[PDB]
Amino acid sequence: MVRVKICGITNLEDALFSVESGADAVGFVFYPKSKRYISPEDARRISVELPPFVFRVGVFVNEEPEKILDVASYVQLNAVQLHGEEPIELCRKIAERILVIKAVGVSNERDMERALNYREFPILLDTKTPEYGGSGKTFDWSLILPYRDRFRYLVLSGGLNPENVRSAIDVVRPFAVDVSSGVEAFPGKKDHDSIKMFIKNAKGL
Amino acid sequence: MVRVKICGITNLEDALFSVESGADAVGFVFYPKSKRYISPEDARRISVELPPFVFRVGVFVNEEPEKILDVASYVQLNAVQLHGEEPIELCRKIAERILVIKAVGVSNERDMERALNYREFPILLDTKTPEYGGSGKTFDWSLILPYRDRFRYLVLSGGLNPENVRSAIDVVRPFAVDVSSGVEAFPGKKDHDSIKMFIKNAKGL
């Protein structure tokens, strides 16, 4: 069965609803220019309130290493998602202290070739970018297939929503699936019926 | 749906099988006198290999605080399970840095009253002790019921096995369920068919 991360959580109620509906991880965006940004202090409040067995992931975009580690210990993150153009050296330094997921933008196979240099880390494939946080009237999920067994663990991301998750999962059969705006009411606020349906469809409940 | 932690993991293959069968957390026992003991070094090897979105919990029994924190950062644990007679002060100090689950032995309601002093932390109720790591031709799960809503998150433990999990869960409706010997081939080695059935029955798959 697939794991599900709900990203862009900005408030306690959305986080708790996610956990109770079956989400395995919640994500906090620590990138200042994001509309889904949450301060380490606001995030800490939420993290501390959440139950065990649910990953708290912090999203950073080209943040300097020392700051990433300080926010992680403060907010008590379980993993760091490096979503910029961080070099493997930076990734390897962070990995000495906390688990790192390297996010890579992907739109064609040259991007998948770039992704293969990071194969030592769990990879989050952020499909069809920039545009927004993801999206497409279904990205050709099959183009990722020939590279699937080259990675240890794969998290599918970008444009996933309640109507298209199952298809994406059937094709790729990833370890996890990730979503932010595909289950939003508006920027920073989740739509509960959407989170419910997304998890039900992704997991086959 | 309930979360499932498989405790007493001593080897990589048992851990990976647990994750792939649906377990949400794996537990490493760092109590030297346990037959399921694993050194921080051996545990680190396994932790580093596991995918994200799966909790690594470390089990300590009356260990001094500084040593608990060192093993946690070294092995990259996501939570600490204090399974001795640790006072709330020790629990509160550890909690400043990493999530803590307080395990409490429970056989009657005086024990549940003792458990209520730790209600600020997620509680693991270790039913019917000492004897072994748990057990009973079903502990009267219903005695925990009147105390259920006093705790934030509850992890049911002790004597759970593939045949009795559903019943225990129906009665209490805990956040999680925990098992070690109920899915073992012998001390330290898991039986894969048992892990499979336990998770399938606990989660209703």
Question: Within 10 A of B68 (CB to CB), how many other CB atoms are there?
Answer: 22
**For residue A17, which residues of chain B lie inside 8 Å, CB to CB?**
none
Residue A52 and residue B153: Cβ atoms within 8 Å?
A: yes
B184 touches chain A (CB under 8 A): no
Element (H, E) at B104: strand B99-106
Helix (H, G, I), strand (E, B) or coil at B174: coil
* Cα separations in angstroms, B186 against B43, B109, B199: 19, 32, 19
- Is residue B75 within 8 A of residue B28, CB to CB? The reply is yes
- State the smallest CA–CA distance between residue B64 and chain A in angstroms: 21
- Residue A138's identity, in one-letter code, is T
Structure tokens that stand for B168 in this block:
């225990």
Mutate to test the interface with B, among A3, A53, A100, A196 (most CBs of B within 10 A): A53
Structure tokens that stand for A31 in this block:
């990138």
Structurally, chain B folds into a number of domains equal to 1
Closest alpha carbon to A98 in A115, A74, A119, A117: A74
Residue pointed to by tokens 């009237």: A137
- Is residue B205 within 8 A of residue A1, CB to CB? The reply is yes
Torsion of CA B143, B145, B151, B152, to 10 degrees: 140
**For residue B5, which residues of chain A lie inside 8 Å, CB to CB?**
53
The technique is X-ray
Residue A52 and residue B53: Cβ atoms within 8 Å?
A: no
CA angle B55, A46, A92 (to 5 degrees): 50
Closest partner residue to A1 (CB to CB) among B22, B73, B98 is: B22
B160 touches chain A (CB under 8 A): no
In the DSSP assignment, the letter for residue A42 is: H
Closest chain B residue by Cα to residue A55: B53
Closest alpha carbon to A4 in A173, A162, A190, A155: A155
Write out the residue range of the structural domain in which residue A17 sits. 1-205
Question: Within 10 A of A88 (CB to CB), how many other CB atoms are there?
Answer: 13
- Is residue A160 within 8 A of residue A178, CB to CB? The reply is yes
Helix (H, G, I), strand (E, B) or coil at B171: helix
B98 touches chain A (CB under 8 A): yes
Structure tokens that stand for A70 in this block:
């300080």
- Residue A165's identity, in one-letter code, is V
Structure tokens that stand for A178 in this block:
């990730």
Cβ contacts of B116 within 8 Å, gap of 6 or more:
B147, B150, B151
- State the smallest CA–CA distance between residue A142 and chain B in angstroms: 23
- State the smallest CA–CA distance between residue B40 and chain A in angstroms: 15
Task: Give the Cα separation of B12 and B50 in Å (integer).
Answer: 9
Active site residue B7: yes
- State the smallest CA–CA distance between residue A110 and chain B in angstroms: 26
Residue pointed to by tokens 């593939």: B162
CATH number at residue A113: 3.20.20.70
- For chain A, give percent helix, strand, coil, nearest 5: 40, 20, 40
Closest chain A residue by Cα to residue B203: A205
Closest partner residue to B52 (CB to CB) among A22, A97, A99 is: A99
Structure tokens that stand for B148 in this block:
């259920």
* Cα separations in angstroms, B88 against A80, A193, B94, B153, B175: 30, 39, 10, 17, 22
* Cα separations in angstroms, B164 against A156, B139, B188, B197, B200: 36, 10, 22, 11, 12
Please, what sign has the CA dihedral across residues A118, A124, A125, A127?
A: negative
